[PDB]
Amino acid sequence: PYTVVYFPVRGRCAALRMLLADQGQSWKEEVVTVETWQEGSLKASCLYGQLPKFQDGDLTLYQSNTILRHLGRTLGLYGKDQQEAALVDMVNDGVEDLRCKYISLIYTNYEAGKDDYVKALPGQLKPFETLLSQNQGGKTFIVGDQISFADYNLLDLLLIHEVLAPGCLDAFPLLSAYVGRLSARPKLKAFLASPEYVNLPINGNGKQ
């Protein structure tokens, strides 16, 4: 079945977990402690020496977005055609770009960079609001009329940003409603409310 190998944090596994949960998929969580990691053997066996590591049967994958695209491809959450598949990629790549900046802030320059980051946030979120406005008035999903892996990734990005800068979505009606709507999906809502999600820190250094 599925197995996600990661440290005890939401981080780069939050989106794929929401996906699996919302899709009614079962998966196993292999929690790696900082101690076990610093031992070296696991890291050495990882393709790029990093986590998350994912297992789908005997298929072992690395890279959070590779896992997202894999699940999207195999579960039918990758658009209805090539045109949509490309747009889903465009959204996910944009989410990744911002996630990298967020990660850099959190682990590299939180105290001194937070103000500049938050000030730059609106311009960084604007693209996703525009995307929604161009797709059925933002009433459905980020691309097309069916959910995609990019939705879960974008949703997580928006959620962690609401924590970083409370109210950042207030000026973005479509993104705001989008968050509430997706978060309301039965399986997803239950997952987001569960200890499994709630008692895990967003990041590994206690910052958010």
Ligand X SMILES: CC/C(=C/SC[C@H](NC(=O)CC[C@H](N)C(=O)O)C(=O)NCC(=O)O)C(=O)c1ccc(OCC(=O)O)c(Cl)c1Cl
Q: Count how many residues are written for the chain.
A: 208
Selection from a second copy, ligand X, none that 206 binds (CB < 5 to 8 A by kind) is none
* Residue whose C-alpha is closest to residue 207's, from 84, 112, 138: 112
Residues of this chain that interact with ligand X (CB under 6 A) are 7, 9, 11-12, 43, 49-52, 63-65, 93, 97, 103, 107-108, 204
Q: Is 63 annotated as a binding residue?
A: yes
Task: Give yes or no for a contact between 85 and 170, defined as CB atoms under 8 angstroms apart.
Answer: no
DSSP 59: E
* Cross-strand pairs, 55: 3, 60
Q: Is 64 annotated as a binding residue?
A: yes
Whole-angstrom distance, CA of residue 54 vs CA of residue 41: 17
Q: Taking CB under 8 A as the criterion, which residues in 96-135 touch a second copy?
A: 97, 100, 123, 127, 130-131
The least distance separating ligand X from the CB of residue 11, rounded to whole angstroms, comes to 5
Question: Residue 148 has which token pair?
Answer: 């995609």
The least distance separating ligand X from the CB of residue 49, rounded to whole angstroms, comes to 6
Whole-angstrom distance, CA of residue 167 vs CA of residue 60: 39
Q: Is 208 annotated as a binding residue?
A: no
The least distance separating a second copy from the CB of residue 64, rounded to whole angstroms, comes to 8
DSSP 143: S
The least distance separating ligand X from the CB of residue 34, rounded to whole angstroms, comes to 8
Please say which residue, 93 or 196, places its beta carbon nearer to ligand X.
93
Selection from a second copy, ligand X, none that 167 binds (CB < 5 to 8 A by kind) is none
Asked if 44 is part of the footprint of a second copy (rule: CB under 8 A), the reply reads: no
Whole-angstrom distance, CA of residue 22 vs CA of residue 24: 6
- 121, containing H or E segment: helix 110-133
Antiparallel, parallel or unpaired: β 2-6 and 59-62: unpaired
Selection from a second copy, ligand X, none that 43 binds (CB < 5 to 8 A by kind) is ligand X
Binding residues vs a second copy (CB under 8 A): 47-49, 59, 61-63, 65-66, 69-70, 73-74, 82-83, 85-87, 89-90, 93-94, 97, 100, 123, 127, 130-131
